[PDB]
Amino acid sequence: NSLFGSVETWPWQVLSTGGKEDVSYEERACEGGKFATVEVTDKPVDEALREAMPKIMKYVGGTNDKGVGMGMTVPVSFAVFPNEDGSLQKKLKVWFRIPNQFQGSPPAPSDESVKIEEREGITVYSTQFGGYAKEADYVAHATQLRTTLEGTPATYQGDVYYCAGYDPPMKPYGRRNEVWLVKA
Ligand code: HEM
């Protein structure tokens, strides 16, 4: 009897790895399906997660019409929107993917802020870094990734990208954070 055998990995396919220098990247075709999203506006990215994420964790924790736990999917991605100077607007949207055994008919969220949405599969360029991430940290690694991708046939969107986290705020050791640039 495993306590967290319900936590599963986001299913994607590693198409290529690159960089090999100070900045490495992975090209991933990530599967779509149903998602639980929470939109937060007029709040910094650091403070948006502190309001949005507990709504997501309560949902998969039994705050749904069936009143059942659902496990979860790691990493938990959220969308940030950069200005022309690289800084992040006060807008945020969580993109938590429903576990596979609940992709068929996701339980409906009791909190109306949590919206079950559906998205198609996307391809992302991902770079990784450790520690507890802040707004300045996501920006710096997004820029270091854009720089590495410049000079290659890579093509990515510029109005939006995603940030991913693999560990709860409690787990300090060996954390993983990623920045996903959506391919176009
Ligand atoms: C800063 C953002 C986060 C906040 C504020 C947060 C907050 C919480 C809260 C309030 C719960 C309890 C929910 C409930 O059952 O009522 C919880 C549970 C949990 N969180 Fe998070 N969390 C965050 C990010 C993460 C991340 C990134 C992960 C790892 C992917 C994670 C993993 C978990 C797990 C595994 C549970 C256990 C669920 C349960 O025991 O029912 N959390 N979190």
Curated annotation (Swiss-Prot):
Its main location: cytoplasm. GO terms for biological process: heme metabolic process. It holds the Pfam family SOUL. InterPro entries: Reg_factor_effector_dom_sf, SOUL_haem-bd. The keyword Coiled coil does not apply. It is found in: Cytoplasm. It comes from the Eukaryota. Ubiquitously expressed. Extremely abundant in liver. One of its GO terms (cellular component) is cytosol. Keywords: Cytoplasm. The keyword Transmembrane does not apply. Gene3D superfamilies: Regulatory factor, effector binding domain. One of its GO terms (molecular function) is heme binding. May bind free porphyrinogens that may be present in the cell and thus facilitate removal of these potentially toxic compound. Binds with a high affinity to one molecule of heme or porphyrins. It binds metalloporphyrins, free porphyrins and N-methylprotoporphyrin with similar affinities. PANTHER family: HEME-BINDING PROTEIN 1, HEME-BINDING PROTEIN-RELATED. Forms a distorted beta-barrel structure, with two helices that are packed against the outer surface of the barrel. Porphyrins are expected to bind to a hydrophobic patch on the outer surface of the beta-barrel structure. Belongs to the HEBP family. Monomer. This is Heme-binding protein 1. The gene is Hebp1.
